[PDB]
Symmetry: C2
Subunit: 141 residues, 2 copies
Amino acid sequence: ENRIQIMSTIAKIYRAMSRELNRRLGELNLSYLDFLVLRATSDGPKTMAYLANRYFVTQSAITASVDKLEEMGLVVRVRDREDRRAILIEITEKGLETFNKGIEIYKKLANEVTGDLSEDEVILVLDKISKILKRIEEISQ
Amino acid sequence: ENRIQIMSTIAKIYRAMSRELNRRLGELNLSYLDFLVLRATSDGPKTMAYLANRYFVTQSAITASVDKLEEMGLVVRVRDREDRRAILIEITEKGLETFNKGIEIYKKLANEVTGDLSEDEVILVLDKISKILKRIEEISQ
Ligand SMILES: [Ca+2]
Ligand SMILES: [Ca+2]
C-alpha cells in the first residue's frame, strides 16, 4: 500500500537525483561517486574499506575513484609512520575547495526539487524519513 | 540545510534498502535489479531500452538481467510477426508468480523500516516526496 510506495518513491527519487548530479558534477570533473568520496573525507581521513561499505559500492569502484581523485590532486593516501600498510584517504586543500563547490551544486539542485515544499513540510518529512533510515541501517547491517 | 539533508537521507535509505533487498531477494534467486525487471514487465511487455532508462542502469546490465531471467523461465523475448528485430520483454506466468513473491518480501521489509510511523505520518511523507519525484524527473530528463 502506502508503505511500499514510500520506499519505491524513495528509490525513484535517488535514481533521478544520482543521474542529474552526475551531469551537474561533470563540470567539476567529478562523478557522483567521486563527490561522495570527497564528502566522506571532508571531515576526516577514511579507510578504503569504510568508503566501500558506507556507500555500498565495490572496492574496485572505490579504488578507481580514489586513484582518480589522487591524480586530480584532491585526496592523498596517508600511511602510518610504522605500519605503512594501514592506509587512510585524506582530503587535500584543493579537494576541500572542489568539495565545497560540489556542495553548492547539490544544494542548488536540492532546493529546486524540494521546491513545492515549504520549510515546515521539508522539516516534517525529514524528521520522519530519518526514522526510516535508522531502522533500515539497523536491519541491513 | 534541511533540504540538503532530505536528499542525502533519501540516498542513504536507498543504499541500505537496496542492500537488504538483494539479500532477501536472494532466496528467490534474484538480485534487486532482476526484481525490478520483473516489476516493470508485470504490467505489460517492456523494451530493453525502456528498462535501462527507467531504472538508470547500463544496457549491458539489463541484457545480463534479462538473459538470466529468460534462462530461469521468468520472462521471454517477443518479436514482431514482421519486424522480428523490435523486441519486447514479456513476463511469464512463472515470472508473475515469482514477482508476487518478491512483492511480499518488499512489502514485509517496507513495513519494518516504516515501523515508527503511523498510517497518517506515512501518508503525509508520501504526498510530499511525491512532489519531489515529479520535479527531479522533470529536471533530469
Ligand atoms: Ca543489525
Ligand atoms: Ca525536462
